[PDB]
Amino acid sequence: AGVAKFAKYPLTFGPSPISNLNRLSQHLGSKVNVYAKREDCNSGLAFGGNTLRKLEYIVPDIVEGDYTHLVSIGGRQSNQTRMVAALAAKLGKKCVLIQEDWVPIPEAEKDVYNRVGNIELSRIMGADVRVIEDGFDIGMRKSFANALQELEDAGHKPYPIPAGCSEHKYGGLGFVGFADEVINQEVELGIKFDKIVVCCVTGSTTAGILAGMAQYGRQDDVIAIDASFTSEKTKEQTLRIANNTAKLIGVEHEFKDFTLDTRFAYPCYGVPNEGTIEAIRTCAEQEGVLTDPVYEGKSMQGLIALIKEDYFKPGANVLYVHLGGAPALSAYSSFFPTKTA
Amino acid sequence: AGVAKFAKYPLTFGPSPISNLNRLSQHLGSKVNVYAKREDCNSGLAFGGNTLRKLEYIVPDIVEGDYTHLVSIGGRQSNQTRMVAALAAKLGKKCVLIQEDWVPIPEAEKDVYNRVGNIELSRIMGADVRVIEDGFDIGMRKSFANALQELEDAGHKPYPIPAGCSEHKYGGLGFVGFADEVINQEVELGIKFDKIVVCCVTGSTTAGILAGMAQYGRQDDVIAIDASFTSEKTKEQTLRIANNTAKLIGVEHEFKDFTLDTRFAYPCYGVPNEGTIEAIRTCAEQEGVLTDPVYEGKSMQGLIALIKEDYFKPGANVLYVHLGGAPALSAYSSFFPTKTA
């Protein structure tokens, strides 16, 4: 073990809080005690979110080096870029964001979907936003490198930050510390977590949560919930990222597979489903917590679908991982007609 | 310690953290040291906010006696309501919200202003939205008292959550507690704050801050930046909310006036100006901190103007109170166009 052997540039108020979605439990029979470690309440850096936790271990490199621009990439309502921007504005450096089409822009949204919610926030922070209608892919793209090549020509020194950083050397270190906080937090509250559920589409987040947890032989507590409807390259990458991190944080326990409940991905990436929404509402109507039609929401149903089928024991304490992404919610206004009388 | 005599219902993570906006300070020419007490990061309740803290002293009554529905009132982008919703969710009750027409909806945003940010959210939390056509006013409304009876006709016992909770018998207590934190935090920071800047509209926030700061004879340290564009009522009400509260807490001192710089409210509640849009940008580009075109962008530009005109003692410590509001930002995307590099 050893995440401590890596330089960390704070970007968060510290240990992310864990919410007790208790009142939401009783609506689910009160079978399993639900808890949510709010990552969506990271910092003041434009709403926060998991990307920050990952970034904290990347900034050092950037800053220590004499760079000029921070270039990332992702979908339209990409939650990440919006946090790469905020990071850029804080490190006081230029930012170039590459947003491609990774979701069939619902017609009843075709207008606002590309200039409202997250992408907007990236512009307000003065980033060099750039739209491109390219397909969805949780792997390196052929527009990112080009953009990179672009600045390297203008006489600048850009810093690469792949989608979700999932393909960034220290993309996992971030959640390795995620684990550590969990362990420490179980002792403060006096509550152990039998299982921890969190979304996944590029890896890093969960992967690090694995190796981090792996530190305590608890990888098993983990319960990913595919949200990219491409379970293939996802369980693959999320699992590959997981081992790499281990090498770094000094973990031997190799990884072969992980609980990747892939029954809630449909339809594709970005488009939710009749259930997705029903959960988003319940969690909302019950707790007050907001989720989104691309991530947190889809896993919030998977979280509830399971609680139904008694996948857990009675009195079981499960820890849900809210990675934020609610700012995108505004680009899916249609999917939520007003409460029926 | 008059704010302790009043019971508080745990609605927020804990004492609101203070961001050291050092990079923005350097930008505004090492005049002062700007700090921001982040109330826009005080909960897991739909992006948190300021109203919440106020509610923590009112929710106690919602539970004690028997109340069926939670009814409030605000504008098509009111946060007060987008938070009362979640509170209604968590407190397990019904949500009736009256959204009066308080802002001349820009011709561009008119096809969105009523179905994004604050509003969309409020709905998702299964709220009973009511887009009424009444106009702006920080005083007790008709559509309001109407529904109170309206519901009390359908046979219920709803709870009166007025505009910003300002009118509410306890509206002030919330921020009287705020002050308490400021002093404690100054201690832990090893520094003293010279002035406190904070947007003002209905008046309960500033009134609380005033009432509480008075506990230490620092009521003058308060600097309210109006955003209603109507001094009289706003000052003549805040100045009222200020006293009533000053008595609940036991603070003798009476407020016959307070610093309410009404230089940026232009042109009207809801709509911004090049100055507002300009501040937001500056701050967002300097700290990754997001501010809204209605309450925090204006209180921010004010904070900026005041620094140009050397309004603060050299090397002063100014605490910029960030009460949230960024959620509505998605309904003002027009005002924020992509920037050139």
Swiss-Prot record, chains A, B:
> What's its EC?
3.5.99.7
> Molecular function terms in GO for this entry?
1-aminocyclopropane-1-carboxylate deaminase activity; D-cysteine desulfhydrase activity; pyridoxal phosphate binding
* UniProt keyword Zinc-finger, yes or no: no
Cofactor(s) this protein cannot do without = pyridoxal 5'-phosphate
Q: Which GO terms describe its biological process?
A: amine catabolic process
The record's keywords, sorted A to Z, are: Acetylation, Hydrolase, Pyridoxal phosphate
Instruction: Name the Gene3D superfamilies for this protein.
Output: 3.40.50.1100
Q: What assembly does the database describe for this protein?
A: Homodimer.
Question: Can you tell me which family this protein belongs to?
Answer: Belongs to the ACC deaminase/D-cysteine desulfhydrase family.
| Protein's recorded name | 1-aminocyclopropane-1-carboxylate deaminase
Q: Which organism is it from?
A: Cyberlindnera saturnus
Top-level taxonomy? Eukaryota, Fungi, Dikarya, Ascomycota, Saccharomycotina
